[PDB]
């Protein structure tokens, strides 16, 4: 690739954590040099705290600035809660229905239920055989974040299809008021 | 834990590269194009329901740059340790011959935030309609990145995402084909 001169990385992170809407909020400010977090401000603690010796000079210094300290303590409101409200309609409430397709991966076949383009992540996918839910023989990839505010998942069912059997993939997601289902006939 | 919003910025030397962005539960809300001193929404509709004054980011970066120098001396010039990326290629949906789909190249857990990604179709690099994200934050403090390639599924095409990063000795290529 070229240019192997050594590198120096500095990262700053202000994390706003929410529990039950804005009922409980926790601000977390982190400073990272290369890959090591050095100093942080945790709203639940109130002041700065060194994480490693490199951050101490800073935790002490910043902690000696009572003004700054108070601003950070109230940022839990002026910053977090504020920002939460700013984009709630298009983040917390963003809703996109998943597209559901079912296809066979040979006697002991594998039925694949693909669920894609959905949001938010919370979802449920179940497999049924003649209306009766199958739990064993089911494996899953879990949530796959596509990086475009969309998720996808593959829930696969291992089974020896018998002629006349009816397999169903059922999906429950915040975007639909009633469960989606796609069927495969053996 | 129901939601998390992260304001994440960084400065890297000797590259003189800086980044400023906000992400929601792992997705990018927007970032600030440093050269255009402009706010860029991950999804355009976002820019109709909210705004961010891009200048504030430029001021934050300047302080980040200065602090990077401070930390660089304080540590006795300890350079970062390269961590090569994990690469995986997938389609954003199930592929169906001659029906619009999208090849996704996910470059995960690496640092520093500098990388080279190239889409190869039958050995040759493509660029028509390709997009990519900026460097997304990870709690372990490494990065993730997405690159996209809209394509028409065909049984006679072979694609490759080609990745280069200081942590690797040679180009890492992830193949994908129908």
């Amino acid at each position: 690739m070229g240019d192997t001169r050594p590198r120096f990385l500095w990262q700053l992170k202000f994390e706003c954590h929410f529990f039950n809407g804005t009922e409980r909020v926790r601000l977390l400010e982190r400073c990272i040099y290369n890959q090591e977090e050095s100093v942080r401000f945790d709203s639940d603690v109130g002041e700065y705290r060194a994480v490693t010796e490199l951050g101490r000079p800073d935790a002490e210094y910043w902690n000696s600035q009572k003004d700054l300290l108070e601003q950070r303590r109230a940022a839990v409101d002026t910053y977090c809660r504020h920002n939460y409200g700013v984009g709630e309609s298009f983040t917390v409430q963003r809703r996109v229905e998943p597209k559901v397709t079912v296809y066979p991966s040979q006697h002991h076949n594998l039925l694949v239920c693909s669920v894609s383009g959905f949001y938010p992540g919370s979802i449920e996918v179940r497999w049924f055989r003649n209306g009766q839910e199958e739990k064993a023989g089911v494996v899953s990839t879990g949530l796959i974040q596509n990086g475009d505010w969309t998720f996808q998942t593959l829930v696969m069912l291992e089974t020896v299809p018998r002629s006349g059997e009816v397999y169903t993939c059922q999906v429950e997601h915040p975007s639909v008021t009633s469960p989606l289902t796609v069927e495969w006939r053996a | 834990e129901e939601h998390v919003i992260i304001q994440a910025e960084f400065y890297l030397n000797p590259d003189q590269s800086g980044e400023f962005m906000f992400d929601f539960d792992g997705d990018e809300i927007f970032h600030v194009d440093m050269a255009k001193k402009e706010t860029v929404w991950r999804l355009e509709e976002f820019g109709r329901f909210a705004s961010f004054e891009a200048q504030g980011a430029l001021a934050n970066i300047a302080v980040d740059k200065a602090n990077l120098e401070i930390m660089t001396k304080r540590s006795n010039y300890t350079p970062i340790t390269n961590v090569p990326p994990e690469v995986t290629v997938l389609t954003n949906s199930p592929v169906e011959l001659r029906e619009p789909n999208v090849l996704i190249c996910f470059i995960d857990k690496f640092t520093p935030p500098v990388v080279n990604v190239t889409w190869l179709r039958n050995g040759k690099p493509v660029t028509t309609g390709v997009s990519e994200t900026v460097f997304l934050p990870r709690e372990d403090h490494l990065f993730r990145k997405f690159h996209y390639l809209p394509f028409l599924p065909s049984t006679e095409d072979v694609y490759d995402c080609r990745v280069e990063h200081w942590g690797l000795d040679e180009p890492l290529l992830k193949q994908w084909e129908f």
Partner: peptide
């Protein structure tokens, strides 16, 4: 609506 960022602080020198 307007997003409000936290300000970067100068480290000890």
């Amino acid at each position: 609506p307007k997003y409000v960022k936290q300000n970067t602080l100068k480290l000890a020198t």
